[PDB]
Design a binder for this molecule. Structure first.
Ligand SMILES: CC(C)CCC[C@@H](C)CCC[C@@H](C)CCC[C@@H](C)CCOC[C@@H](CO)OCC[C@H](C)CCC[C@H](C)CCC[C@H](C)CCCC(C)C
Ligand SMILES: CC(C)CCC[C@@H](C)CCC[C@@H](C)CCC[C@@H](C)CCOC[C@@H](CO)OCC[C@H](C)CCC[C@H](C)CCC[C@H](C)CCCC(C)C
Ligand SMILES: CC(C)CCC[C@@H](C)CCC[C@@H](C)CCC[C@@H](C)CCOC[C@@H](CO)OCC[C@H](C)CCC[C@H](C)CCC[C@H](C)CCCC(C)C
Ligand SMILES: CC(C)CCC[C@@H](C)CCC[C@@H](C)CCC[C@@H](C)CCOC[C@@H](CO)OCC[C@H](C)CCC[C@H](C)CCC[C@H](C)CCCC(C)C
Ligand SMILES: CC(C)CCC[C@@H](C)CCC[C@@H](C)CCC[C@@H](C)CCOC[C@@H](CO)OCC[C@H](C)CCC[C@H](C)CCC[C@H](C)CCCC(C)C
Ligand SMILES: CC(C)CCC[C@@H](C)CCC[C@@H](C)CCC[C@@H](C)CCOC[C@@H](CO)OCC[C@H](C)CCC[C@H](C)CCC[C@H](C)CCCC(C)C
Ligand SMILES: CC(C)CCC[C@@H](C)CCC[C@@H](C)CCC[C@@H](C)CCO[C@@H](CO)COCC[C@@H](C)CCC[C@H](C)CCC[C@@H](C)CCCC(C)C
Ligand SMILES: CC(C)CCC[C@@H](C)CCC[C@@H](C)CCC[C@@H](C)CCO[C@@H](CO)COCC[C@@H](C)CCC[C@H](C)CCC[C@@H](C)CCCC(C)C
Ligand SMILES: CC(C)CCC[C@@H](C)CCC[C@@H](C)CCC[C@@H](C)CCO[C@@H](CO)COCC[C@@H](C)CCC[C@H](C)CCC[C@@H](C)CCCC(C)C
Ligand SMILES: CC(C)CCC[C@@H](C)CCC[C@H](C)CCC[C@@H](C)CCO[C@@H](CO)COCC[C@H](C)CCC[C@@H](C)CCC[C@@H](C)CCCC(C)C
Ligand SMILES: CC(C)CCC[C@@H](C)CCC[C@H](C)CCC[C@@H](C)CCO[C@@H](CO)COCC[C@H](C)CCC[C@@H](C)CCC[C@@H](C)CCCC(C)C
Ligand SMILES: CC(C)CCC[C@@H](C)CCC[C@H](C)CCC[C@@H](C)CCO[C@@H](CO)COCC[C@H](C)CCC[C@@H](C)CCC[C@@H](C)CCCC(C)C
Ligand SMILES: *C/C=C(C)/C=C/C=C(C)/C=C/C1=C(C)CCCC1(C)C
Ligand SMILES: *C/C=C(C)/C=C/C=C(C)/C=C/C1=C(C)CCCC1(C)C
Ligand SMILES: *C/C=C(C)/C=C/C=C(C)/C=C/C1=C(C)CCCC1(C)C
Lengths: 230, 230, 230
């Protein structure tokens, strides 16, 4: 309770934990192989986030980085979360549209570059260089957003309407929520330091629960996750 | 030789190295694609363990963690081993039964959570919180054990008898040996400290060689690893 | 500019960045799923290397390792690069020949052992033991080279001539360039220290740009990356 942001770390831990349990129960019983892949992906995402929220809450996932002459509290565990959960979210989208394997590779690899350069920026001790990593990471994010909108152009032919509809909704959820993360980091504790860590943590908690549990609720309620069967 | 547990680290290095060489030789010549996947998986497992045993033996894979007011010797290299070798062992089981891809994802991701939360527990400086990570990791292990027993329920129909027989044996080997690891950690150097590090290292060496080389000997001697062919 | 090797780190950053941009543009428009996988793999390789070259240039990817009684500058970011880019290069080769999945596993796992034991050697504080890790890593490299020459022996039957021709060329490029890396490390800053870090960095920059951008130019100009189509 000693860090003011504890309350949002606690709330994020609880909501990710409850979302995980909900999705775990919800997928109990499903047999359809296509649906099993979406439940597995979609349940792992908040499970991983639960563990990394808890590590921040307990202090394990926090480190001090000197930059600006100051000792700056940097929650590194966010990058260990996102390293796994953001490619998993992209895989859910990619599987929905039956993406080609080359496209999945491009997406997962650009996402790794996005998170790994964000982690390098988050831990860089020369203040000005932190924003160079932010820019490179943002370029990788823009590439991902580009592929999500313009990289499935051969798939439209042979896409079930309900898959098309659930994919468009989740793609729009993804583009809006993910695009807010570079802005929060830029103005927050890792970047310019104009928004305090307390509020930054709240913002990422709202984004994360929305991008993982809210995304997952929309996907897992959809018929698009089942193969078409008589 | 300065740490009493060196002898078990040396013995573990040698047995993993010899098991690797044996499996490498044994799979020389196999053409069958199914069998090649099992030899590859099963040979990589003790090869990786050989390197991490050697890193503990040479001291690289040891760190001191303050907790309990004391400086506690924690062999972190075990988690770098298990991060790769325990999903590989699960993949051998999963391939045997032709598991659905969603099930393999669930298994590999729960296993990553199990090892990563065990690593966080192993390095946590607040003593009481180490057991919170142990509990979460144990929950993930129990999920894996649950899936190995109740998650292949559609596969029984179309399973060759020899695959069914080798899978049941290896599944039983896996459930018994893996379940001992949380107990050893709980009573050993990472947990309550009731069993000294010397004996703990012996216990994990016996478990590891059994779970990797003993498992691999049972699998690789089986006809279940070959596709059925005239 | 304070470290004499900065100029090769700068040149390597620029050439990897320009190679990435070139391959990104070059693959704009390709529809063929086979070709998309090769463009994705082959574009990610210099993109990742660009980020790790930049991290060395900016100092983030450098650490000091005590060994020999001295504080030795070790660029660890090379291992974070190679951890991802060397399996990706192997995947390009493997996909060219339609390798069996067991063979791809063997290659990617031996490559992980090669890079992870090279990283352990690079950070080991007992000088003599650094060469033990070098030897193990070299054994893994020799295994990979062995598989590239003798592990596709069932694939020769059903291999298009242009795939066979591009694969032989890239395989020869790979064996020659990769084999130089253990020699550079052995005589350079990480090993015996007979070649200064400045020259070592130049050597790895020439190898890396050749093994990634030069390799990629040969592959991506080939018809072998397209499925055979009327
Ligand atoms: C967390 C617990 C419920 C585990 C402990 C219980 C044990 C066994 C009993 C539960 C068991 C009956 C599970 C029932 C579900 C069935 C199949 C489950 O999963 C379905 C899919 C693919 O269809 O993958 C879904 C993928 C999933 C991945 C599993 C990860 C989990 C691991 C534990 C830590 C997490 C965090 C949640 C904490 C909260 C509090
Ligand atoms: C959860 C999500 C929806 C997040 C989406 C991303 C997003 C763009 C981030 C917005 C964060 C913001 C609301 C938080 C405000 C912090 C702030 C009030 C700090 C207060 O305390 C200190 C002061 C000076 O006294 O600094 C003052 C700080 C300021 C400079 C605050 C700047 C915020 C903006 C000017 C709002 C931009 C408009 C957007 C909605 C873009 C569309
Ligand atoms: C360790 C050495 C034998 C390597 C050095 C030798 C070189 C080349 C000569 C050996 C060569 C003829 C290998 C013969 C086997 C053939 C094909 C091998 O592998 C078969 C399968 C799939 O069928 O994958 C199997 C997957 C396997 C993965 C390879 C990992 C190894 C890498 C080296 C370090 C290890 C640790 C063992 C140390 C002991 C001492
Ligand atoms: C290789 C594997 C098969 C491992 C399987 C997992 C397993 C449950 C772990 C057992 C470990 C155990 C045999 C090691 C004993 C350590 C011990 C003798 C320490 C000696 O020295 C100090 C003392 C006090 O003087 O502490 C005293 C320490 C004690 C409290 C020891 C506690 C051990 C048990 C009471 C045995 C439980 C029974 C099981 C076989 C479960 C079935
Ligand atoms: C680097 C920039 C061009 C990104 C910013 C731009 C944004 C959107 C505009 C560009 C956009 C029109 C891309 C056009 C290409 C199309 C499809 C691209 O990719 C094709 C394949 C599979 O066929 O994967 C190919 C796999 C590839 C992986 C993408 C990784 C990149 C990420 C950014 C950092 C890098 C480093 C390069 C820096 C230099 C300077
Ligand atoms: C980019 C690539 C092609 C690299 C391929 C791998 C390769 C084998 C590495 C060669 C590196 C080499 C040319 C660099 C030379 C460093 C060197 C001149 C150092 C100079 O300064 C200090 C001195 C003493 O005054 O040490 C003296 C240092 C010496 C001992 C230098 C040793 C180099 C050799 C004797 C050359 C071997 C022949 C090969 C071409 C193998 C075929
Ligand atoms: C899915 C859910 C039930 C998760 C609920 C949210 C939760 C994890 C975080 C909320 C913290 C909350 C209790 C706030 C008040 C603090 C308080 C207790 C007293 C203050 O008092 C103080 C004074 O400084 C702090 O106490 C010590 C530390 C604790 C407060 C933190 C404990 C860790 C957690 C509560 C989480 C435990 C994880 C488990 C789910 C493990 C089981 C795994 C498995 C079976 C799948
Ligand atoms: C597959 C096998 C042959 C492995 C055999 C077991 C072994 C790796 C560990 C046993 C240690 C043992 C010799 C005990 C006595 C110590 C002693 C030498 C003297 C004591 O004297 C002392 C005094 O404190 C310590 O010596 C210095 C360190 C060494 C003892 C340790 C050296 C490392 C290893 C012996 C392993 C080397 C790895 C290789 C396989 C590399 C090749 C890779 C490739 C070709 C695939
Ligand atoms: C693809 C290319 C355009 C890459 C070009 C090469 C380059 C990255 C490295 C060359 C350094 C060079 C300018 C040498 C002179 C130094 C100098 C400026 C003055 C010396 O003056 C000094 C005194 O000590 C140092 O300056 C401070 C640091 C900088 C010199 C380094 C800045 C980082 C880089 C220049 C790279 C930026 C990365 C971007 C591509 C981000 C955008 C991502 C996205 C849109 C895809
Ligand atoms: C968020 C992101 C930036 C992260 C992206 C990925 C990331 C984790 C990068 C990792 C690269 C690298 C380790 C960097 C080190 C930095 C540093 C300063 C020191 C680190 O930290 C230290 C300091 O004490 C220890 O590291 C050395 C040991 C290793 C970390 C573990 C060794 C592993 C092996 C030798 C075993 C072989 C593994 C394989 C077989 C894997 C293949 C799987 C297969 C079987 C299919
Ligand atoms: C046992 C477990 C807990 C481990 C589970 C996974 C694990 C390794 C978690 C890693 C997350 C994270 C790095 C945590 C950092 C903690 C910390 C305090 C600081 C670390 O350690 C430090 C301290 O000096 C350095 O880290 C920063 C640099 C990075 C480690 C490496 C950067 C990688 C990239 C920028 C390149 C892009 C990579 C991708 C392209 C990968 C995608 C593959 C593709 C091409 C298909
Ligand atoms: C170049 C090579 C040697 C590297 C090869 C791989 C490598 C990165 C090895 C990593 C092992 C290990 C982390 C070693 C730690 C060393 C040390 C001294 C301390 C480190 O560094 C520290 C010091 O502060 C922090 O580490 C602990 C936290 C973790 C690093 C991150 C935890 C991750 C999780 C708990 C979440 C679960 C992840 C999974 C779900 C992944 C599965 C994917 C799925 C969903 C499909
Ligand atoms: C589950 C959490 C999700 C969906 C997180 C998304 C994170 C991002 C899109 C992060 C992007 C970043 C940048 C583009 C620039 C650097 C800072 C980051 C890593 C916050
Ligand atoms: C090759 C080595 C094998 C099979 C290792 C298995 C390791 C485990 C099943 C570890 C489990 C753990 C817990 C469930 C709780 C926390 C402590 C661990 C990581 C030892
Ligand atoms: C893109 C960069 C490439 C192709 C790098 C290749 C790196 C190697 C083949 C590294 C090999 C090493 C050894 C065999 C011994 C230990 C030192 C290393 C890691 C340099």
């Amino acid at each position: 309770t000693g860090r003011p942001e504890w309350i949002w770390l606690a709330l994020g831990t609880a909501l990710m934990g409850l979302g995980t349990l909900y999705f775990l129960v919800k997928g109990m019983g499903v047999s359809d192989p296509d649906a099993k892949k979406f439940y597995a992906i979609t349940t792992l995402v908040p499970a991983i986030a639960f563990t990394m929220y808890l590590s921040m809450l307990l202090g394990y996932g926090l480190t001090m980085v000197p930059f600006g002459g100051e000792q700056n509290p940097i929650y590194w565990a966010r990058y260990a979360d996102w390293l796994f959960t953001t490619p998993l979210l992209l895989l859910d989208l990619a599987l929905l549209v039956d993406a080609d394997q080359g496209t999945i590779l491009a997406l997962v690899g650009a996402d790794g570059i996005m998170i790994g350069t964000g982690l390098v920026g988050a831990l860089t001790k020369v203040y000005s260089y932190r924003f160079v990593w932010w820019a490179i990471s943002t370029a990788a994010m823009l590439y991902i957003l580009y592929v999500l909108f313009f990289g499935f152009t051969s798939k439209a032919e042979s896409m079930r309407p309900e898959v098309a509809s659930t994919f468009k909704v989740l793609r729009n959820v993804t583009v809006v929520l993910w695009s807010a993360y570079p802005v929060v980091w830029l103005i927050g504790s890792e970047g310019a330091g104009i928004v305090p860590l307390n509020i930054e943590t709240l913002l990422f908690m709202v984004l994360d629960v929305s991008a993982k549990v809210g995304f997952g609720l929309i996907l897992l309620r959809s018929r698009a996750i089942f193969g078409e069967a008589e």
